[PDB]
């Protein structure tokens, strides 16, 4: 009457660790079936990990507030990247204000100068890196830069960028992420070797605010932010919120974009691309807000389906402070409760043919899709991400046709914190169009 099933473990100290990491999808789908149940509890190093793997129950995982299902204790890994007292590392009532602060920078108000701004920077990269009319790309790596450029372009003010280029803002993020490795969620030079890259960026920041005062973007907005108790944000506090904002968008969107273009450039799917064209073809090079947002519904379905099939975030997780019920089963305080976009988006009631890419499919259980989370942890980057990505496809499939070298689409590479299409498989051949 008290707790969901448990899965067999041959040797206890290992805790399913190699079984997951080999393939976590295969793994989890096997647990589900065999264990004749969508909810089920796996062990990692004798640490009990109960997955909410029946789509019908998603509400159970995402509705209860942080005090009942706490994210902090799982995501401690990030404290050195974000800050100490920022995001999870901060206290919840406070964190919420940070969420809203950030959310009050991606508001649809500040999106009016984004579409063109990102559209322009796409070409800059194209005309300067895709030079010939016969192409090579490592799409994963190329998207990686388009995204971190267009975002910086979107959120970094002219004075900021000139001091901190997109091309090598990355290098900092990419030094900060080096601190993060697998097997940190359930269990140093890099604490300082990433600390140095934060301390670098931070003092690069503090050095631009002095040039602002003696005299608006995400930074600008963030500094004019005042807490409940009327306090302002510390230098590092603010610095982190740029880091987290920016970290968050970059792999997930790069991957989302890379996946998306891969399916579309694939012949198997070239009725969809033609539909993409029937959608973007009477649009001129002058992309405006109303175009990407109101007149690109099918393009959005492609992007959404790309996330549906290969979600970049495989698990989200909480720490069960109070006890919670989920279907018949119950989850006992002290447990790590998880919920996996990857497994969930493979349930068969919800997504028939879950390895098929059907942009015009529709979840058959309501709430199944959770590639941007749900409940009280709905992603705040969502609209923006969709906006980047949409515009990029719009621009890049207008003015090009694309050709995957392979016979079929790449294989996800489950061997990272944030999953995308296998790097070495992402080679593509572009060819100009007029
Ligand atoms: C396009 C790819 C993206 C995906 C797939 C994605 C996915 C998700 C998911 C699954 C969550 C839930 C996390 C959780 O339950 O703890 C989430 C939350 C969040 N995402 Fe995103 N995200 C994306 C882009 C972005 C971007 C661009 C931003 C920032 C601009 C962002 C900021 C956040 C934040 C702040 C949260 C936390 C919401 C909360 O805990 O209350 N995400 N995202
Ligand atoms: C607004 C400030 C206060 C703030 C607070 C929290 C976040 N959260 C965050 O970035 O979560 C990413 C996951 N994510 C990526 C894309 N969309 C979501 C993440 C990374 C590693 C982990 F371990 C757990 C979570 C962002 C900004």
Spell out the domain ranges in the chain: 1-434
Backbone conformation region of residue 384, classed left if phi is above 0, alpha if psi is from -120 to 50, else beta: alpha
Whole-Å CA distances, 315 to 50, 74, 194, 336, 352 = 11, 11, 24, 12, 21
Among 282, 272, 274, which residue's Cα sits nearest to residue 303? 272
Ligand 1: centre distance to CA 372 (Å): 6
Give 199-202's long-range contacts (Cβ < 8 A, gap of 24+): 200/172, 201/164, 201/172, 201/239, 201/242, 201/243, 202/235, 202/236, 202/239
d(CA 337, CA 52): 7
Residues in Cβ contact with 383 at an 8 Å cutoff, skipping those fewer than 6 apart: 106, 108, 111
Q: Which CATH number fits domain 1-434: 1.10.645.10, 3.40.640.10, 1.10.630.10, 3.40.50.300?
A: 1.10.630.10
d(CA 338, CA 318): 6
Q: What angle do CA 210, 211, 215 make, to 5 degrees?
A: 110
Give the gyration radius of the chain's Cα atoms.
22
Burial of residue 423 (number of CB atoms within 10 Å: 0-12, 13-18, 19+):
middle
Q: What angle do CA 201, 145, 155 make, to 5 degrees?
A: 55
Ligand 1: centre distance to CA 127 (Å): 31
Question: What is the token pair recorded at 82?
Answer: 């974000």
d(CA 180, CA 175): 10
Whole-Å CA distances, 107 to 112, 119, 238, 426, 430 = 10, 19, 18, 33, 35
CA-proximal residue: ligand 2, atom 14 (nearest): 248
Pocket test for ligand 1, best of 82, 250, 258, 381 (most atoms within 8 A of CB): 381
Place of tokens 């492609």: 302
d(CA 16, CA 42): 7
Place of tokens 């991957």: 255
Q: What angle do CA 96, 375, 155 make, to 5 degrees?
A: 50
400 within 8 A of 381, measured Cβ to Cβ = no
Q: How far is CA 340 from the centre of its chain?
A: 14
Burial of residue 215 (number of CB atoms within 10 Å: 0-12, 13-18, 19+):
exposed
d(CA 426, CA 429): 10
**Which atom of ligand 2 is the closest one to the Cα of 247?**
10
377 lines ligand 1 (CB under 6 A): yes
313 lines ligand 1 (CB under 6 A): yes
Burial of residue 393 (number of CB atoms within 10 Å: 0-12, 13-18, 19+):
buried
Ligand closest to the CA atom of residue 318: 1
**Phi/psi of residue 177, nearest 5 degrees:** -75, -30
Place of tokens 């989850």: 331
19 lines ligand 1 (CB under 6 A): no
Resolution in A: 2.7
68 lines ligand 1 (CB under 6 A): no
d(CA 420, CA 411): 9
Q: Pairing state of beta strands 336-339 and 47-52?
A: parallel
Experimental technique used to determine this entry: X-ray
Ligand 2: centre distance to CA 248 (Å): 6
77 lines ligand 2 (CB under 6 A): yes
**What are the beta bridge partners of residue 270?**
none
244 lines ligand 2 (CB under 6 A): yes
Whole-Å CA distances, 98 to 56, 166, 250 = 31, 24, 20
71 lines ligand 1 (CB under 6 A): yes
Sheet harboring 47-52: ordered strands across? 39-44, 47-52, 336-339, 316-320, 69-70
- What secondary structure, in 3-state letters, does the chain show? CCCCCECCCCCCCCCCHHHHHHCHHHHHHHHHHHCCCCEEEEEECCEEEEEECCHHHHHHHHCCCCCCEECCCCHHHHHHHHCCCCHHHCCHHHHHHHHHHHHCCCCCCCCCCCHHHHHHHHHHHHHHHCCCCCCCEEHHHHHHHHHHHHHHHHHCCHHHHHHCCHHHHHHHHHHHHHHCCCCCCCCCHHHHHHHHHHHHHHHHHHHHHHHHHCCCCHHHHHHCCCCCCCCCCCHHHHHHHHHHHHHHHHHHHHHHHHHHHHHHHCHHHCCHHHHHHHHHCCCCCCCCHHHHHHCCHHHHHHHHHHHHHCCCCCCEEEEECCCEEECCEEECCCCEEEECHHHHCCCCCCCCCCCCCCCCCCCCCCCCCCCCCCHHHCCCCHHHHHHHHHHHHHHHHCCEEEEECCCCCCCECCCCCCCCECHHHCEEEEEECC
């Amino acid at each position: 009457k008290k707790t969901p099933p448990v899965y067999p473990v041959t040797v206890p100290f290992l805790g399913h660790i190699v079984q997951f990491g080999k393939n976590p999808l295969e793994f989890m789908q096997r647990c589900k079936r065999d264990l004749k149940s969508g909810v089920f509890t796996i062990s990692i190093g004798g640490q009990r990990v109960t997955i909410v793997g029946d789509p019908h129950e998603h509400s159970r995982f995402f509705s209860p507030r942080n005090e009942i299902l706490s994210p902090r204790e799982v995501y401690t890994i990030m404290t050195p990247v974000f800050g100490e007292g920022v995001a999870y590392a901060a206290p919840y009532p406070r964190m919420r204000e940070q969420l809203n602060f950030l959310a009050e920078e991606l508001t649809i108000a500040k999106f009016q100068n984004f579409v063109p701004a990102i559209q322009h920077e796409v070409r800059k990269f194209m005309a300067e890196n895709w030079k010939e009319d016969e192409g090579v790309i490592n799409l994963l790596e190329d998207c990686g830069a388009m995204i971190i450029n267009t975002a910086c372009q979107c959120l970094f003010g002219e004075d900021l960028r000139k001091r901190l280029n997109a091309r090598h803002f990355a290098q900092l993020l990419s030094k900060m992420e080096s601190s993060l490795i697998p097997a940190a969620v359930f269990m140093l030079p890099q604490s300082a070797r990433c600390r140095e890259a934060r301390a670098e960026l931070q003092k690069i920041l503090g050095e631009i605010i002095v040039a602002r005062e003696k005299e608006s973007d995400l930074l600008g907005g963030l500094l004019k932010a005042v807490y409940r108790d009327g306090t302002r944000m510390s230098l590092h506090e603010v610095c982190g919120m740029i880091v987290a904002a920016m970290f968050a968008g970059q792999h997930t969107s790069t991957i989302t974009t890379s996946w998306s273009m891969l399916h579309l450039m694939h012949p198997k799917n070239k009725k969809w691309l033609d539909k993409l064209h029937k959608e973007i073809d009477e649009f001129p090079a002058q992309l405006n807000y109303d175009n990407v947002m109101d007149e690109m519904p099918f393009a959005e379905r492609c992007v959404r389906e790309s996330i549906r099939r290969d979600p970049p975030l495989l698990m989200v997780m909480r720490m069960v402070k109070a006890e919670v019920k989920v279907g018949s089963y119950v989850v006992p305080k002290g447990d790590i409760i998880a919920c996996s976009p990857l497994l969930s988006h493979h349930d068969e009631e919800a997504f028939p043919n879950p390895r098929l890419w059907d942009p015009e499919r529709d979840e058959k259980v309501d709430g199944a899709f959770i590639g941007f989370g749900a409940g009280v942890h709905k992603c705040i980057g969502q609209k923006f991400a969709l906006l980047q990505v949409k515009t990029i496809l719009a621009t890049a499939f207008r003015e090009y046709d694309f050709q995957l070298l392979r016979d079929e689409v790449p294989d996800p590479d489950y061997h990272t914190m944030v999953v995308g299409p296998t790097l070495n498989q992402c080679l593509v051949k572009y060819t100009r169009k007029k």
